[PDB]
A paper describes a structure:
[name] is a member of the DnaQ-like 3′–5′ exonucleases with a DEDDh domain that contains four acidic DEDD residues (D23, E25, D125, and D186) for binding of two magnesium ions, and one histidine residue (H181) for functioning as the general base in the active site for the hydrolysis of the 3′-terminal phosphodiester bond of a nucleic acid chain. To determine the molecular function of [name], we show here by biochemical and structural approaches that it is a structure-specific DNase capable of digesting intermediate structured DNA during DNA repair.
In the crystal structure, the Y-structured DNA was bound to [name] in a unique way, different from those of the bulge DNA and the duplex DNA that were bound between the two protomers with one strand of DNA bound to one protomer. In contrast, both strands of the Y-structured DNA were bound to a single protomer, one Y-structured DNA bound to protomer A and the other DNA molecule bound to protomer B. This unique binding mode can avoid the hindrance produced by Phe29, which might stack with the 5′-end base of the opposite nonscissile strand if the Y-structured DNA was bound in a way similar to that of a duplex DNA. Therefore, in this complex, the opposite nonscissile strand of the Y-structured DNA rotated about 180° to interact with the same protomer of [name]. Several residues, including Gln169, Asp174, Phe175, and Ser177, interacted with the nonscissile strand forming hydrogen bonds with the first and second phosphates in the 5′-overhang region, making it fit snugly onto the molecular surface of [name]. The 3′ tail of the Y-structured DNA in the crystal structure had a dinucleotide 3′-CC sequence. However, the 3′-CC did not induce the C effect and inhibit the exonuclease activity of [name]. A close look at the crystal structure of the Y-structured DNA complex showed that the 3′-end C did not interact with Glu73 as it did in the duplex complexes. Moreover, the scissile phosphate of the 3′-end C did not shift away from the active site, and as a result, two Mg2+ ions were bound in the active site in an active conformation.
Residue numbers in the entry: 8 to 213
Write the structure that this text describes.
Amino acid sequence: TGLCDRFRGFYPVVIDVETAGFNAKTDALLEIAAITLKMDEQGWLMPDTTLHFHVEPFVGANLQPEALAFNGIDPNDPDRGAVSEYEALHEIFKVVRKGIKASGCNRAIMVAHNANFDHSFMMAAAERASLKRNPFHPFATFDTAALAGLALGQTVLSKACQTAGMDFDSTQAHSALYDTERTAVLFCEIVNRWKRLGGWPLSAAE
DNA sequence: TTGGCCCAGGGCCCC
Ligand SMILES: [Mg+2]
Ligand SMILES: [Mg+2]
């Protein structure tokens, strides 16, 4: 009933990014939050550690106005508190490598909504900053849109949360911290409901 | 417990 036995040794980490566009290679990463997970004694999954950073646009990054219109971020504001892609990701990777070790996992896997998006941005930022020993799987993800489709019959984040019996706020939507937390709680509830229904462990049904 | 965008009104929701 250990975390390391749940996902074949993958350590699931919830990620949401806010960006200045849809292209991971050309558009600025502006914000990232990460939430690691843990299992209790009863084997229920739940949020553990929470990290959140404002990110300084990389050298030569594009900034799409419509993106900034959508997320309401201003990369010029000297008050936002931005750090380098190197800084935010170094911190995230350190906390993650520590969680992998403590739980006896061997690799992290990104949990995110329409996960290829956040995965592509984090990987692009890691490559730019030349971070070595990136603990995240280089192509596998746990997409909560697909998981919600299965569990809840909904793929839109806000709707999936509401369908799962969670609160989800519009006026708080479109900020990394809130997004990541709701996503983490959605993922945990999906995993936990599968367990409550006797789908896990694989021996439980019989 | 989406308001606003994008291809008048409908449907979309990873920025
Ligand atoms: Mg968001
Ligand atoms: Mg997102």
